Amino acid sequence: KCTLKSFTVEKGIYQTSNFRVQPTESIVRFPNITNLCPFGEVFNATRFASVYAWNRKRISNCVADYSVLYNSASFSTFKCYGVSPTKLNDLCFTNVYADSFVIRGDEVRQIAPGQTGKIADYNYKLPDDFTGCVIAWNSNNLDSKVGGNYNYRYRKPFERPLQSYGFQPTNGVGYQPYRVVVLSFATVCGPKKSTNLVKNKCVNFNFNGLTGTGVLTESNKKFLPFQQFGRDIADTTDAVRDPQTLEILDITPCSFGGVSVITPGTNTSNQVAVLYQGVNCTEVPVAIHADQLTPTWRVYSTGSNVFQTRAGCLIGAEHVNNSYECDIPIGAGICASYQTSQSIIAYTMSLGAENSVAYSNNSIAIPTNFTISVTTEILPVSMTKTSVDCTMYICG
Amino acid sequence: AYTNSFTRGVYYPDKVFRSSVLHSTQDLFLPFFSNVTWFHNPVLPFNDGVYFASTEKSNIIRGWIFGTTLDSKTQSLLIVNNATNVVIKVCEFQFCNDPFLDVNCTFEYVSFKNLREFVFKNIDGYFKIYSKHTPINLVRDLPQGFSALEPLVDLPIGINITRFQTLLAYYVGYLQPRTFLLKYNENGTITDAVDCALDPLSET
Amino acid sequence: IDRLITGRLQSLQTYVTQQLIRAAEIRASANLAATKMSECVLGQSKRVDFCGKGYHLMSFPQSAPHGVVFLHVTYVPAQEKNFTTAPAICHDGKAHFPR
Amino acid sequence: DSTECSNLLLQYGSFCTQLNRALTGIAVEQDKNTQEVFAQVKQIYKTPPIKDFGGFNFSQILPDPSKSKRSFIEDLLFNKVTNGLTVLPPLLTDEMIAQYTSALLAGTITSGWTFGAGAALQIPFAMQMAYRFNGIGVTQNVLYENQKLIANQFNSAIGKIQDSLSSTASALGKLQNVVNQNAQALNTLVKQLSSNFGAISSVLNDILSRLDKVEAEVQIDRLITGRLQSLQTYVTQQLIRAAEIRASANLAATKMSECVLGQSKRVDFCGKGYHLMSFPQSAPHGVVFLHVTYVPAQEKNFTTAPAICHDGKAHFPREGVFVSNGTHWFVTQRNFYEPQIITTDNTFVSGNCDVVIGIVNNTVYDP
Amino acid sequence: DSTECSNLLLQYGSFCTQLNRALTGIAVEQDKNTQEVFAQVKQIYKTPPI
Ligand SMILES: *[C@@H]1O[C@H](CO)[C@@H](O[C@@H]2O[C@H](CO)[C@@H](O)[C@H](O)[C@H]2NC(C)=O)[C@H](O)[C@H]1NC(C)=O
Ligand SMILES: *[C@@H]1O[C@H](CO)[C@@H](O[C@@H]2O[C@H](CO)[C@@H](O)[C@H](O)[C@H]2NC(C)=O)[C@H](O)[C@H]1NC(C)=O
Ligand SMILES: *[C@@H]1O[C@H](CO)[C@@H](O[C@@H]2O[C@H](CO)[C@@H](O)[C@H](O)[C@H]2NC(C)=O)[C@H](O)[C@H]1NC(C)=O
Ligand SMILES: *[C@@H]1O[C@H](CO)[C@@H](O)[C@H](O)[C@H]1NC(C)=O
Ligand SMILES: *[C@@H]1O[C@H](CO)[C@@H](O)[C@H](O)[C@H]1NC(C)=O
Ligand SMILES: *[C@@H]1O[C@H](CO)[C@@H](O)[C@H](O)[C@H]1NC(C)=O
Ligand SMILES: *[C@@H]1O[C@H](CO)[C@@H](O)[C@H](O)[C@H]1NC(C)=O
Ligand SMILES: *[C@@H]1O[C@H](CO)[C@@H](O)[C@H](O)[C@H]1NC(C)=O
Ligand SMILES: *[C@@H]1O[C@H](CO)[C@@H](O)[C@H](O)[C@H]1NC(C)=O
Ligand SMILES: *[C@@H]1O[C@H](CO)[C@@H](O)[C@H](O)[C@H]1NC(C)=O
Ligand SMILES: *[C@@H]1O[C@H](CO)[C@@H](O)[C@H](O)[C@H]1NC(C)=O
Ligand SMILES: *[C@@H]1O[C@H](CO)[C@@H](O)[C@H](O)[C@H]1NC(C)=O
Ligand SMILES: *[C@@H]1O[C@H](CO)[C@@H](O)[C@H](O)[C@H]1NC(C)=O
Ligand SMILES: *[C@@H]1O[C@H](CO)[C@@H](O)[C@H](O)[C@H]1NC(C)=O
Ligand SMILES: *[C@@H]1O[C@H](CO)[C@@H](O)[C@H](O)[C@H]1NC(C)=O
Ligand SMILES: *[C@@H]1O[C@H](CO)[C@@H](O)[C@H](O)[C@H]1NC(C)=O
């Protein structure tokens, strides 16, 4: 009724909807992760150089372990100019410029990127635009001299207001000596996570950043060693290599098709049948209104003589052993009708009564009577005439 | 001196499998039957990228230099084979006519009876190497036969290569933007090609 | 406004193109109806199943909205009997065939 | 199947619905066209167990129970043809189509045209061919006197068709063009998904992941516009193409009603020569007619005159033409040389010798 | 014949090719129409002089 915009429906088969199997879960695959960036080569060296005057250099072309760096209490404190380290675990840069050096904490409190004071402006130069962080530990444990901070100057990330540091050896990195480092920004990219691989179910998927939805399956294509994707004639991706397990998976569409309602007119009955065109009955109780939706809909999904045909799964119609003339057509020689106590039935249509003509080489049949017959024929001849003022239709 | 390039120097343009199909594509390719220069090192422009080849039975070729000048000014690719491995670095190296044998550094890496063929190109700052090896009977010119070069190396390094030279018989041709029709067999190898500009029949 | 002008113009081109195709579909039926009137009504067509099933006798035109209706009068044989038959007859040594 | 795109597609209203209503109109019509052609028979006639059709040999075009149970020639005809899109099945299966071509053929073989005008009336096939000869103005004695020659000319001609259809596929180009056009159009519709239409990428998930919404919606609307225009271009082309196939299906339905169910006298309609009969065979996406025709083949020159003078009366032939062999005069049936003696019973009179140009003097015999 | 425009027209993909293919099929068909109407004769018959 809503499809036709009418409260009264004439007899027929009406397409009302599209059925489309939903992805059941998401699969993510990337290679066996290797060559992580050695951030310890900066942050384990934090006692060494002068934190107001040291040099700095790029870390690049190796995977940024920022996810583990967020969870790990690897230093007494850390702070960042950009986002939190868990957000940095999703990012990349051409390199992160970085350094390690100790200083008096009264100066070193200015060395967090985007901070106030002479460090972030010059002696540990790093505005809020720095794509990264600074971190530290108490230098009084090893980085400070016998006189405290006098072994270094205090005010790039952790690199060149610098003067010989005055912080006493008796206290921690917030005012007394701090052992410290900093690092901030196509090569320094964070690692990519991965899941298990699932087969023979409709899934959402991502292989190396190539994405889709489909039924993943075991396959017998033989790619060359360097090839990663397979394509069909019309550009369409149809196979992939799992980067963790170098065999080939075929990608197949998640099952979909037109949904049509088969009805005698509303004058005759409110009983109906439903055809899921090109669907296999095993797949039907999915996506749209199905087995869940009360006696008002699940009757046409769960029961009422579910039946399989070459046209699709057919629900609500009884299979019948006879043949009759085609009333409402379905496909592949199937037709349906409302019949006697009455229900919707589906049957193979009947071409006509069979007849052996009694031929033999000396027999003829001659008619001995006639009937005059009057046959009606109807032909259309002319449409309703029309003209449209497009100036008024378009601009009113 | 010059030689006819024949149908040499096709290479797999992408990391994709296609089978029993003809695929039409536009890329930097060596045009069929172009003139290819021949040599017995001299410093040559790189242009849009190079088809390079050599005929061997001695292993006297040992590497290449690529960059603008490759003498202390700026980063330059030194690519070497030492028969233990391929060796690469991109340094501002400083040397004479070359660091040839007796016969900063932002990146580094490790990996006549015969013809060795290569294609070198740079797109989006990715320096790309494609290669092939074959035996030969024509120790004198490029053979009149078809085989497709396949990728090796694909480096994001972004250097302005404009000159190159060999490190110690060899042949040089230049890539040009061309449209090719490529034939993939049942196993997804390229097995034939048409350079679409070559003649009216190739356009057809 | 330019989005509405673009959308409404495309929406009108779609209608006019479908009406041009539908007009050709109806004209092919008008040429057929004009031929059925000339051959069936103004004559007696020998063209099998053109002017109704059975052997054609005559037909009558009746008008209808947007069209025409033909009442085809036709002759249909009935009540056959089987008989023995032969292609020719020998009389005085010579073969006779029916006129 | 991107929801962020599908929300923008609602801005366009009824376009992505009247397209489906148009393609549905095409899809129903293909079953109608198939039913206009084949379903012209009310009962499924079937051939007798005996095959004594007067020396004619239909076994190459009749059903074969070792084959569906198609004919021999129908198997050649079936061999020589070779993203939210759904193809749909035809309503009549190839096993139903082959029952209609079987029934039409078994009617035509056993009962002539009679099954096209009432119940099928049996008749001997040699007598059916005598009616087909009368239908072309050749007197029926000509068939019976030449029946074994005529049977062998027919049997020979069917054999050449099997060899032609075995040796080359090039005859079926009309049907193969339908298959090629359907495939070419669908590949073109899918290829157009890869095009940018000026958007920053042709991959919708790039746009959605790389841009903020106020920018992304501007890019997606280019893809929506390009893909909608690419689908309207395909549907418009399919409506124009379906009208060509319908004009061919109406012609094929007419060829079946006139050539198979009768004996059409329309010149060149049922193949070259004077029409005798024709036989349908099924094929992929179409139908094949084997048109059988009589072609006259060994002419001689003769002298002729429009009338003859006897006792002042001018005599004209009833059904024939006057001819001479240079020494004698005869009346002859116009389509095959069989000279008869000129008599009062082969002729009729009108007026005297003065008015007719070129009248000649000869005896007209009185039996 | 602007190069800057032609490079934009490539982004609309296959529309130009299927227009050229449509008008090529239209053009070939006119010669077939004209053949089928007039060329129904197997020999160039010629009238006698008288
Ligand atoms: C009808 O003609 C066919 C050939 O077109 C005849 O079939 C062949 O008959 C011979 C002898 O039996 C066999 O060796 C061939 O193998 C048959 N060919 C096929 C394709 O089956 C057939 O015998 C003829 N029938 C009549 C009644 O004359
Ligand atoms: C023209 O036809 C007539 C009849 O067929 C021919 O006349 C007969 O000729 C044969 C010899 O060829 C004679 O035995 C008959 O007695 C003739 N019959 C009569 C009634 O005369 C005549 O020969 C033919 N003319 C030519 C030039 O062939
Ligand atoms: C056909 O026969 C008639 C006689 O039956 C011929 O007519 C006569 O011909 C002679 C000689 O020319 C005349 O003397 C008579 O006066 C004619 N009579 C009439 C009534 O015309 C006639 O010439 C013959 N026709 C031909 C073509 O030979
Ligand atoms: C990935 O690692 C597993 C062990 O965790 C190993 O069995 C497998 O072979 C590796 N695959 C690749 C492609 O390196
Ligand atoms: C349909 O049925 C209703 C009663 O249920 C009746 O009023 C109406 O006239 C009927 N219409 C037709 C077309 O039979
Ligand atoms: C799919 O459909 C076929 C009939 O087309 C049926 O036999 C088969 O059991 C179905 N497959 C599954 C896995 O349900
Ligand atoms: C139809 O008949 C078959 C036997 O030929 C039987 O197996 C089947 O159950 C019957 N189905 C119905 C609905 O009668
Ligand atoms: C012929 O059929 C009519 C009815 O159509 C019947 O009334 C009449 O008696 C029949 N005549 C003969 C001779 O059978
Ligand atoms: C350049 O190559 C062409 C064949 O492509 C050849 O005809 C021509 O002679 C060559 N020119 C020189 C200078 O060798
Ligand atoms: C080294 O790299 C820096 C930028 O990181 C650049 O300023 C300098 O010129 C380079 N020097 C050489 C010798 O390449
Ligand atoms: C060859 O290169 C490898 C590293 O790729 C190195 O270990 C080895 O010592 C080199 N040998 C020679 C002879 O240069
Ligand atoms: C490469 O050289 C061009 C000018 O020739 C210049 O625009 C570009 O910035 C250079 N890139 C690098 C990485 O030096
Ligand atoms: C394809 O590859 C297989 C091994 O994977 C090989 O046996 C076969 O000969 C190859 N076929 C072709 C056509 O190259
Ligand atoms: C004609 O005769 C056959 C037997 O030779 C018989 O089967 C058939 O029913 C008869 N038909 C009529 C109309 O009498
Ligand atoms: C008829 O005779 C003329 C010569 O008088 C000749 O050219 C022509 O070919 C002949 N035709 C036949 C059918 O013999
Ligand atoms: C044919 O033409 C000749 C010469 O004019 C004339 O004598 C003769 O009577 C004509 N015959 C016929 C049958 O027209």
Curated annotation (Swiss-Prot), chain E:
Source species, domain of life: Viruses
Function: Precursor of the fusion protein processed in the biosynthesis of the S protein and the formation of virus particle. Mediates fusion of the virion and cellular membranes by functioning as a class I viral fusion protein. Contains two viral fusion peptides that are unmasked after cleavage. The S2/S2' cleavage occurs during virus entry at the cell membrane by host TMPRSS2 or during endocytosis by host CSTL.
Protein name per Swiss-Prot or TrEMBL: Spike protein S2
Organism whose genome encodes this protein: Severe acute respiratory syndrome coronavirus 2
Upper lineage: Viruses, Riboviria, Orthornavirae, Pisuviricota, Pisoniviricetes
Coverage span on the entire protein: 745 to 794 of 1273
